[PDB]
Amino acid sequence: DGFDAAAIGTQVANVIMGFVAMVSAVGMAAITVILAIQGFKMAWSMIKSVK
Amino acid sequence: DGFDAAAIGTQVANVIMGFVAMVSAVGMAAITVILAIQGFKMAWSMIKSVK
Amino acid sequence: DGFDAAAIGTQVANVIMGFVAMVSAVGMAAITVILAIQGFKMAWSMIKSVK
Amino acid sequence: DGFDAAAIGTQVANVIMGFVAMVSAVGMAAITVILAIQGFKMAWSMIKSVK
Amino acid sequence: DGFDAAAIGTQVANVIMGFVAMVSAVGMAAITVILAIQGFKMAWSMIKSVK
Amino acid sequence: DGFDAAAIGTQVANVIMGFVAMVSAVGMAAITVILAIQGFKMAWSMIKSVK
Amino acid sequence: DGFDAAAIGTQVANVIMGFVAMVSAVGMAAITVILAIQGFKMAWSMIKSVK
Amino acid sequence: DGFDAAAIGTQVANVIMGFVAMVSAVGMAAITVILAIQGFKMAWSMIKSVK
Amino acid sequence: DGFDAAAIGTQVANVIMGFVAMVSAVGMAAITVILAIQGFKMAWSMIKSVK
Amino acid sequence: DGFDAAAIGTQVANVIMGFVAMVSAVGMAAITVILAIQGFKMAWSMIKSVK
Amino acid sequence: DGFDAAAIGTQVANVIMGFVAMVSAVGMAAITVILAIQGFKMAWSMIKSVK
Amino acid sequence: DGFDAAAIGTQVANVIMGFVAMVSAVGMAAITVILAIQGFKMAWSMIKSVK
Amino acid sequence: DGFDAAAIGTQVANVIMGFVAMVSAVGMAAITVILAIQGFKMAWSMIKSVK
Amino acid sequence: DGFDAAAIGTQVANVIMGFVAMVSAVGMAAITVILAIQGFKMAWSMIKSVK
Amino acid sequence: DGFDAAAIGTQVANVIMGFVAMVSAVGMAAITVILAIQGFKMAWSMIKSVK
């Protein structure tokens, strides 16, 4: 009857495409860790196979 | 007696096949997130197994 | 006395076996949605476990 | 006799299609919460499977 | 008739957008735990694959 | 009306930030095990590749 | 005529906003339990995936 | 009028904070099992990767 | 009122600490298998690296 | 006038605190079943993840 | 008054402790299947890692 | 009263021990695949380490 | 006075213990379906984890 | 009195054992999909571990 | 009575065997990625073992 479906259907989507920011931010604060270990793993990794 | 069953039975269905749009839209605003993490996951994933 | 029980008892049933049509129609206008999400869910689902 | 059925039948419906607004508003004040947790859930979720 | 629908419809929403605070707070008091284990999991995790 | 939301919202969080202790304790009583095996794994691990 | 509606309408509400206390109290005596199990669940949960 | 709300509201809570005991007891009689398997799982687990 | 909580709370636990037996038994009938393969795996494993 | 309220009010309660017995008994004859399946579930559960 | 509570309370329990039999039987006719797959899974599983 | 529990309890089990056949059949039509790859994997596997 | 209570009280019960038959029959015509899907679910289920 | 219980009790079951057909059909139109992905998953899966 | 079960049972299946297309398409847009990394992985992989 009214059909206020798509009008609010975009409104809702716009609240939550403007939410990637958080996932990227917590992203960055994953990698710093994953590098820290990874880069530290690769430190000894060569000098395992130094032999 | 009257049998206004199918006539309105389509009417009702037409209000709600015209509702996928919202589910697609909130769809798109799922994937952007899921890529963001996923693509960021695959970033470190190769360079876990860099070794 | 009169026993107009089964005669109208079928009459009533015939108004309402001719009512499945609506339930099928609103059926179809469920699945289009459920696919939309489901198929979109399966989109990212493989590429979660891409790794 | 009078048949003031549809005339007021619309009148009543118009009081209550003009009621979605509230359901949308309490809608918005659901999602902010559901994001808050959800986005915070996804925060640790990647870094469960950091490994 | 009166149509005090949206006026109180916002009033109700404002009681409950001012409720995220609790969900964030119990949020923080989830992560401290989830880090505690997670960070402690990652402690041994590298030195599983020390080999 | 009353709005005793944040006041108890902190109260609840304080019961459960004071819960990490247990997770750390069961933490310690994970690692002792994980070392035991890990350190015992590394015992033979060098003297696999003694050759 | 008299219109002693709102005057007692508040009176009634005040008997029953002063009732949250009980729901909070039985609240606390839910969580102690839910922690007990939850914290005990998380005890073995890490050391399932110790592997 | 009487307002015997909090007085019995504590009374009820005290019947059911004195109920954790059972949940801890059935707790202990979970872990013995979960260890039994877990410790037995870790038995073969090292000597899978003995190689 | 009655407070038959801990009395039956132990009763229930005693039915189910007397249940480890089964988990140990199905334990033994895991390892026989896991040895069978494992010991058979280690059979060829040395004589892969015989070279 | 008479006020035979609490006198019979206890009388009634005493008929029905002496009713837990049945609920415990049908309790026991739940768990035997729930163990039977549960313990049988845990039988194959380890040897799913035997791998 | 009569207090035919425990007398029938056992009667009811005895109908339904004599019901485990079915759950064990449908038990056996689970495992035969679960072995069939499991044992067949373990067939190829070694000879994945044959290498 | 009637106690038609075990009589049908076997009847049900017999419908579903006569169901392994399907699981074996879909079994066979797993392995043909798993061999195909596995045997093809082992083809190049030796002639990786031909050197 | 007459006390034709238990005499008809059994009569009524005998009409409706002779009613399980239907519930078993509609039982069988549940499982055939539930197997059909279940057995078909287990078809792909192994060959999800074929990997 | 009449006892038209089993006579219609079969009638009802026969409407709904003649319903598996649909569940098999929607079955087939599950697997085609599940293969499509699965077979496509196994495509890259070998050539992950090509190395 | 009507038995419009298989007639619509095919109708439903035909909406969803005509759905593989999407899963193949999102398929292709998995592999391009998986190659990209895989082929790039194999780039350095030989020249790890160049030695």
Automatic annotation (TrEMBL), chains A, B, C, D, E, F, G, H, I, J, K, L, M, N, O:
Origin species: Neisseria meningitidis serogroup A / serotype 4A (strain DSM 15465 / Z2491)
Q: Which UniProt keywords apply?
A: Membrane, Signal, Transmembrane, Transmembrane helix
Instruction: List where the protein spans the membrane.
Output: 16-37
Protein name per its UniProtKB record = Integral membrane protein
Highest taxon of source: Bacteria
| Shown stretch of the complete protein | 26 to 76 of 76
